[PDB]
Symmetry: D2
Subunit: 459 residues, 4 copies
């Protein structure tokens, strides 16, 4: 049921059917901490990087073409997700990600062996590389792809759903709320245009971090000097990665020492994700408050029904998607604090918090991507406004008596506001009931002064 | 103008009327970062400690009685707040608080010189001491005093105001809300008993941290070994401090190395303050939402008017104290993250983040103390309930069909709640209209089960 | 392929072999956010609670004995870990944990149906219950068990390893370091007694939070009033749970409204875990710095070799366990910020951030437990001291002039330390060269005061 | 000693010599919380804004020129700092900053009264304004000025000091450190070029947030609709503010509802400040570790002496500026968490956490500005390298034996590395001592293979 493998420290017993070897098995026994390993996106990025490195080593005549072809074929299988069960090392491993780097090299060597090609995991699969430049490179590839190919399109879909509702509800007049108290009129469309701008500003924030998030350490080797790698190894690997993936945001780092001694690009990108979580909290909280009730809440809008709300209270339906959004936002805030903590504590030539920082930034990208699409499609798209109820409260608000001052005086306007609340009537009906229609104020003049939609000043 | 002072590094120009000397002046020029120095409570604790150290050196015959008397007299003036303008060093100074320690030593030496007593700031005022044991000792004295003499009585005052409302509003029935949606009846008194328990648990949390917050490093000197101090210096200084402050929570550290290499007691105490901030956010948010509107909100309660809110919108009054509470809570959360960051980054024999950690913990104590008293007196005490509106809300919730589950089942009760909402009819009428009155449920049993105050089970 | 199931909202297509029903399937389609569900400990606690609830309903004659026997049998299989693949709902679900509660109810109903017993998931399995009191109860059961049965024994094992080193290295003199600069002598044993106290205070912190962490909401039902449950349901369920788990820390909540409107006990417990993470960072950082180099570092101690560190740099072995400890500590800091965020944002009768708060607190417990045992066994236990090098460092520090303050004063002692460093001479020789030997200080008194082990003042 | 003032709530006793009136005095009694009010920069921004508003109201013929001139003259005095003792309201005030807005209006009215001009604090000084658009406008003016006029020049000064040291130390060869262990050679110049890039990337991060940090709410009034303000009030006020201050980054908000319902621009800018704090922690930690000792540390560099280090240990000097930097960084991390907390908790038309968010963001700008200049001038500029010691350790490192493999074999190279450490000799001397110089390897060939500066691959 087991086999014997070797490294510079001795013999190691490895499960017979595992594609990994001695160094991965040592890491399995050294780090049983979370029971969770690398994600699909991380394994994909490691496979992409190893294939591109083999291509460049072959191009420079440093690696035999048959060996390079075997790495490229094996690495493509890893990048496609055919061997995700061959990456058992915990996230909480050696801080440079050496163990997961060794894990990729050993799995490539075992795949190639099945095709009759002998590869040395270090001498062939890790040629011109170090763990110190490859694991952060794979991390930054995965984070750049998560930003460009998944998060930005998901945020754009949420922006478009919010902007469509802002247009549908352009004339849906309602009463404004400041400090949670009755204020002057607004439209439901104006509030949703505000939410749309928060998401649009979110996309701008992600785009602004891309020139530094896309910076790759590849070619810097052990300390950033590029020792034991060709001088143009970095630019050549990046050129191959851009041609294969289409991820134009990928680039060699401006400074090779900053690219390995620190992970400031991840701290920066997390700050953008954290700001999006802050924006999403406001939007989701306002939406669940607008849908509150039906009889003891605000009852401004109706959220689409997604599932029975209670195991005990029958008929009750809860805002389950705003709840999922606010919980994701809390997770992003938490992950952000762990990333910054890891980011600050590098030492000299290497920051050794990379696997922990990678786990947190990639999870925040994933959670925000998936919850934004669900929020857009299963909540925002199907919202219904209680138009008549919203207009009635705006027309019954004591805040709209101020344009009556030049006709009846502020004293009489305050008396109108007081009687309207007491009798639960509109300001218009109260002005009529108090016998104020005459030479001083006509009904046409009253409807002009109390035009709540005009007070909202919609475009 | 200026005068010339000196230290082991050379000459320094010091302002003519300043009671501080060379090393304080170097610190004034080295750290112009925030423009803020030690607080009144920090200067008081440094004053108390220097006086206590002089008393013990005198008792052990290590310092001449007249020299000790001059330090005790000068340290009493510092602790009293007579020389607060003589402490100009920034909070963001050397991480051990060496500069602020030398500031106390130099100011004491100058006050004593006015009385004709010559004291060496290092050899006499700092006898048997180090900044490594004195600055964290003064920090832990200040934090222990802030917890025991100020925060706990303020939280007790808030608890008592909340518990009094819970008693007054014991039968004030209203609709419960879960996920912000209409739920089964509760009383306003039941919710306020919930808030009172949160504050009561807050006091319990502060009291549970006191055995480690009260631990003092005094006696450990430079690295915790107690070199250049008598073997019982620490226990004797703590005994003088306990007698003078009445703070029995003050004690010698269990391990003299942990007491200087780490500031874990401040990280622990901040965690309790952070939980109180979390409890206060929920209480303040619920109260401002209960007072929201009136027309566009819940309009459940009325908050006392504390100041005009708007001129453009006549008579608009805002929940200003809940706003002050939630902003304070945000600050406590922030200060907590700063404290934990500093606490983790100690190295070998000393954690060099003490002035920053002291600033943040003492501010969190002060903010929570002051806002809790204002919240209790200017908001909670004067709250009034809209009793008739609240009863109408309790009776309008469709979730009042819940006690009928044992009689008609969950699925049939769901069909009742949905039909009642669609046809704009009561739960009672919908049960009758769906022909549910029979052997399993009589009309008298239905009226008994639908009583909203009885449903709240007060 | 699929079968038809139903809830109060309508029909749902459920996979043919799934033990879950309509409401779990709705939750599978509503929340595909993280791709991760409840942990083994959460499923165990839900299993234990459902069994205990069925036992009490049976004792009070509210549920037929055969129906109760089937629930107890099915709930025991769930708690044992036989049906973990039957819990597919995401962590980022409805904030009350309604979906995961219905998941337990539906799986129990399907297991019992295999034995010829017909159970209604709401009316029978959820009898006298709500998700509002059961999901936070299962969370607090899991967190209390993690604290008492797992974390405290792991921290005790770490304390014992640190205290054993403190005893072995009692007279291993070295130079103290403050601000990273040369200070007066200490022993390696004295520093390790400091680390042992930090872990001992960590256990004290966990124990101090237990009276509130152990508080269970069971019996409070929908809003905390206990409507649709017997008056003593809570005390009876807690008594069954204490008897079955041996966890005397489990108790009924002091206030049934605070127990559901807030999750303050989890915020409090996280604060204790965060302080342990802060203590572990200092201990792990000091140990990796003591083992640094050897040539370019402090080279004070030797850490046991756990795996090869480099192939390019032969024989380079890295402090992999301190790296795992400091990365875990960063994760605990992050999880703590997420927990506090969720805890503050409750509204009226319910805090709807429980699944997120549960994920983060239980992960922090698991990470600290597992890394503390590995740190104690694979790092602390096998540490070796470079005794001769350490004594030379103690003797080389110029700060050894400190015990002469009572004899020559601070100012004269400063002139000694500075002259000794400038002329590359010892403190002893500089005191002689500056003509300081006389009545105030004899040569025998100087040699007595300059003894580095005596200066460390070891008990 | 006191006088009677009035508002819509009644009579208020005010100190006789105070320039503030009834509404400010109410706020003094309502909020005694921190004992700290608005900073100099906040008062300056409020004065600038009120003067610009009076100018626009006069230009549009809405305010009498004599009244406008009196506001402009009074507001200029406030902006200059002549009346900072007239702003006693606590930071922890009403969340919109209404109290501080009223404070500015009342002080302006009292200054103008001394010149014989009667102003109504609301009708004249607050004309076309609301607290909801003015306090966040003043906050964003102060934050934009702090970024552009103070932080960016202070960071540029720190970058230039670090880059100058990187050039001075271009050939100062030393041994690299990864995981705190001995690694291949680097230069001290290469590490400082890394630090310089972190600060340069910091400036880029601050510049990237300016398009949204500079957005002003002015003209949006109570709810963002612009009701009771001229349609072009916002663009006209911003035009005046840009012309007077030269702060071209100031602009009207893209969306008037997003500009008042949220403070996402402050959360975003804080994220940039937090990333700078993370970068500064790494730079300051490396510098104090490089300067550690002088005899029990790394002793790579010498920091300039700034003050006596210890009250007890004479002659000892501590890295006081790296300590001030790392403490400031911790404060920025803390302030960042408070800003995000406030940012997420807005409701409907207004975020009511503005005074707390303003305090924290402006303090972080101030702390980073002042500590960067002090770090550049009192620490970085005067650093000295221990050149001979650094070269000796690099030439004695077992890591540099790898280029000997093609001459003597890896087995003999490992034996050379082992003997070199044992005898505390250079690799070069050990190769000679082992009698390896011959036909297989000449001394010229040995010096070429062991050229440590060439191994660092300096530009």
């Amino acid at each position: 049921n087991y086999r014997i493998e070797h490294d510079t420290m001795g013999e190691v017993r490895v499960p017979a059917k595992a594609l990994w070897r001695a160094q991965t098995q040592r890491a399995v026994e050294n780090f049983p901490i979370s029971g969770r390993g690398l994600e699909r996106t991380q394994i994909r990025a490691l496979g992409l990087l190893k294939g591109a490195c083999a291509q460049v080593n072959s191009d420079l005549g440093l690696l035999a073409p048959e060996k390079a072809d075997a790495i490229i074929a094996a690495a493509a299988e890893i990048a496609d997700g055919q061997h995700d069960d061959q990456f058992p090392i915990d996230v909480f491993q050696t801080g440079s990600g050496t163990s997961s780097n060794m894990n990729t090299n050993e799995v490539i060597a075992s795949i190639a062996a099945k095709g009759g090609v002998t590869l040395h995991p270090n001498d062939d699969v890790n040629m011109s590389q170090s763990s110190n430049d490859t694991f952060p490179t794979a991390t930054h590839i995965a984070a750049t792809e998560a930003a460009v190919a998944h998060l930005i399109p998901a945020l754009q879909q949420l922006h478009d759903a919010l902007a469509a509702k802002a247009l549908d509800w352009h004339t849906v007049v309602k009463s404004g709320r400041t400090h949670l108290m009755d204020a002057v009129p607004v439209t439901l469309g104006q509030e949703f245009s505000g939410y749309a701008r928060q998401i649009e500003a979110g996309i701008e924030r992600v785009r602004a971090c891309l020139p530094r998030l896309g910076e790759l350490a590849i070619g810097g080797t052990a300390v950033g000097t590029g020792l034991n790698a060709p001088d143009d190894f970095g630019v050549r690997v990046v050129a191959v990665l851009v041609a294969q993936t289409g991820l134009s945001e990928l680039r060699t780092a401006a400074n090779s020492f900053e690219a390995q001694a620190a992970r400031d690009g991840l701290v920066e990108a997390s700050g953008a994700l954290r700001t999006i979580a802050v924006s999403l909290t406001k939007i989701a909280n306002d939406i669940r408050w607008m849908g509150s009730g039906p009889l003891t809440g605000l009852a401004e809008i109706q959220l689409p029904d997604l599932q029975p709300g209670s195991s005990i209270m029958p008929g009750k339906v809860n805002p389950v998607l705003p709840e999922a959004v606010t919980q994701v936002a809390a997770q992003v805030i938490g992950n952000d604090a762990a990333i910054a903590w890891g980011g600050a504590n590098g030492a000299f030539e290497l920051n050794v918090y990379i696997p922990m920082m990678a786990r947190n930034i990639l999870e925040s990208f994933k959670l925000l991507t998936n919850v934004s699409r669900l929020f857009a499609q299963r909540c925002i798209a199907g919202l219904t406004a209680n138009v008549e109820h919203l207009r009635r409260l705006a027309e019954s608000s004591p805040s709209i008596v101020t344009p009556l001052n030049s006709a009846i005086g502020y004293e009489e306007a305050a008396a109108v506001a007081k009687q309207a609340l007491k009798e639960r009537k509109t300001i218009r009906q109260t002005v009529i009931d108090r016998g104020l229609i005459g030479d001083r104020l006509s009904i046409e003049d009253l409807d002009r002064r109390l035009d709540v939609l005009a007070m909202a000043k919609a475009e």
